[PDB]
Design a protein around this ligand. Structure first.
Ligand code: HEM
Ligand code: HEM
Lengths: 145, 145
């Protein structure tokens, strides 16, 4: 249940998400591409889903990958801005869930983004505490897939 | 090209876009839904394209419409944030262009959004100069359609 999942975002979790987002959200292009390049490197079996982006190994030099990556960060920005209102958070989460259901992405495979996020956070000196908070937000999307 | 259309956005135009967005972008849920409802009210022929959203006459109460509307405002947020780097603006514009090309939305039809934006701007007392500035931004996306 996406609603029960959203309820897991307690005061402490929301604070950790906001505090860490202030840092990682400041460079959407850089951290967005970093997150994607990590996903492709750690889970090569997911590259097939991104055929439209072309040669993803090119990283920042790939215009389609850069456009996709920046936009992905705005989806996260959207989630963060809706933390105050559960009903709005859920409707935006379900919107993005549809974008992935149509691409045949399961909850299990969507969860593969946790590794990349933990690594991007770690590179900014944000440890497991923050990685776990972000896993709870990702879990809300997983509940809708 | 799209790059040409973006590279032409002048300092004055960018100033007007940023000043007006400071206001209309501060209430994404409210202004996003208002923009969509106005599109359906003045251009009823577009309603069919949004069948996935269900009964759009439900307005704010329609969770699918609300989720879509909030997300549309973040696409605009994305554009505004990329104004000083045409290369990044172009790659995000092309990304959203694909979302519409796949739905068979022509450049002419995409331009139907200008009416709603003009009315939303007007509700906050931003006149013709501002509407013209936004039409130029919309024209960048049209260059990709
Ligand atoms: C924090 C997690 C993630 C977020 C917020 C997110 C967000 C997005 C957004 C905003 C889009 C563009 C939607 C569209 O225009 O159709 C997208 C596309 C896509 N996502 Fe994700 N995504 C995430 C994780 C994943 C993961 C882990 C996978 C795969 C294992 C995945 C697979 C896809 C695919 C295949 C596309 C289509 C790309 C294209 O052809 O343009 N996403 N995602
Ligand atoms: C300021 C201009 C506009 C922006 C920034 C914009 C942005 C968006 C975004 C972000 C999406 C979601 C893409 C996806 O998840 O697949 C979308 C979907 C869509 N847009 Fe637009 N759009 C604009 C104008 C228009 C206009 C004028 C039309 C029609 C005449 C249009 C038709 C569509 C359709 C049919 C969808 C698919 C809705 C669905 O089934 O979820 N858009 N748009």
């Amino acid at each position: 249940s996406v609603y029960d999942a959203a309820a897991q975002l307690t005061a402490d979790v929301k604070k950790d998400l906001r505090d860490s987002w202030k840092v990682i959200g400041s460079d959407k292009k850089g951290n967005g591409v970093a997150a994607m390049t990590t996903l492709f490197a750690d889970n090569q079996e997911t590259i097939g889903y991104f055929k439209r982006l072309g040669d993803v190994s090119q990283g920042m030099a790939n215009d389609k990958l850069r456009g996709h990556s920046i936009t992905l960060m705005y989806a996260l920005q959207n989630f963060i801005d809706q933390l105050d209102n559960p009903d709005d958070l859920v409707c935006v989460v379900e919107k993005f869930a549809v974008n992935h259901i149509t691409r045949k992405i399961s909850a299990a495979e969507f969860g593969k983004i946790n590794g990349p996020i933990k690594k991007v956070l770690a590179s900014k000196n944000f440890g497991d505490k923050y990685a776990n908070a972000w896993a709870k937000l990702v879990a809300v999307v997983q509940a809708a897939l």
